[PDB]
Amino acid sequence: EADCGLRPLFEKKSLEDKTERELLESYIDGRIVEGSDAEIGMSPWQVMLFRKSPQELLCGASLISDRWVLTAAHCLLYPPWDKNFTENDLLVRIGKHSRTRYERNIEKISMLEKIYIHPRYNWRENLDRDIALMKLKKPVAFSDYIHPVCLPDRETAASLLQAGYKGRVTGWGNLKETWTANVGKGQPSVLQVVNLPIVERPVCKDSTRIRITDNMFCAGYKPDEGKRGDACEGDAGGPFVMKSPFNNRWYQMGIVSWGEGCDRDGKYGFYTHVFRLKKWIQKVIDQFG
Predict the structure, then answer these.
(1) Strands 68-71 and 132-136, how do they pair?
(2) Which of 38, 124, 144, 176 could disulfide-link to 191, CB 3.0 to 4.6 Å?
(3) How far is CA 135 from the centre of its chain?
(4) What are the domain boundaries of the chain?
(5) Cis peptide leading into residue 54 (ω within 30°)
(6) Fold of 44-148+276-289
(7) What is the CATH number assigned to the segment(s) 32-43+149-275?
(8) Which residue intervals define the domain Peptidase S1 in the entry?
(9) H/E run at residue 286
């Protein structure tokens, strides 16, 4: 993807968003509250996986080219919950900021041609290879609000995905909505952004009963600080992104995965490691586009 990861309303316009410098510096402020309303056009690869009937937000996703959308497999297929969505059940909504308003002349609604789930996706013993691709029926036109994210290459994967570096999750709080014990305050009105540090793998593992496979990584703050920046702000299947200081581009390093730990503890988010599964992603795009 030639133009990926450069945002029309930011990089292309010589503007920076309110916290990208903090990401690039790996800076963790002493402040408590990290989550906030996203700025317009800040995440133009953001996608809503929407149910046709009844009309509801199912999951998040990301735009990786004019015909391809990336998401988590469990958003589409989870047999223990009698979950199996077919192409005809779903729509994708691209270019959105408002959670609920139809954003006429800004958002685009696309139909699905075909769903592809990782052949080695596992839900039986534990969740693993939690990744899926969706091919759109028609190419989406890019705009100021609609633009694809980059996927990492080998060297970008190794240099960016390190403990203590900071990434970013954006979404409409679908993870919290799915997994919350109690609906306190509702879902957010507007796309949300939170920056989160990558966590050391042994620290992740000791925090949870859920198995952290090698195809997963984790991000978030130590329970110690009373921080109100939370992974739950993202949507299952949505993007975890990092900006490269090498080429100024945004790369999707992770996919928001299983959210069972979005009760209380201040707990780490789990993400599918995108580069580890890239051989499959690239094969599908290259062969079945």
Answers:
(1) antiparallel
(2) 38
(3) 17
(4) 32-43+149-275, 44-148+276-289
(5) yes
(6) Thrombin, subunit H (2.40.10)
(7) 2.40.10.10
(8) 32-286
(9) helix 278-288
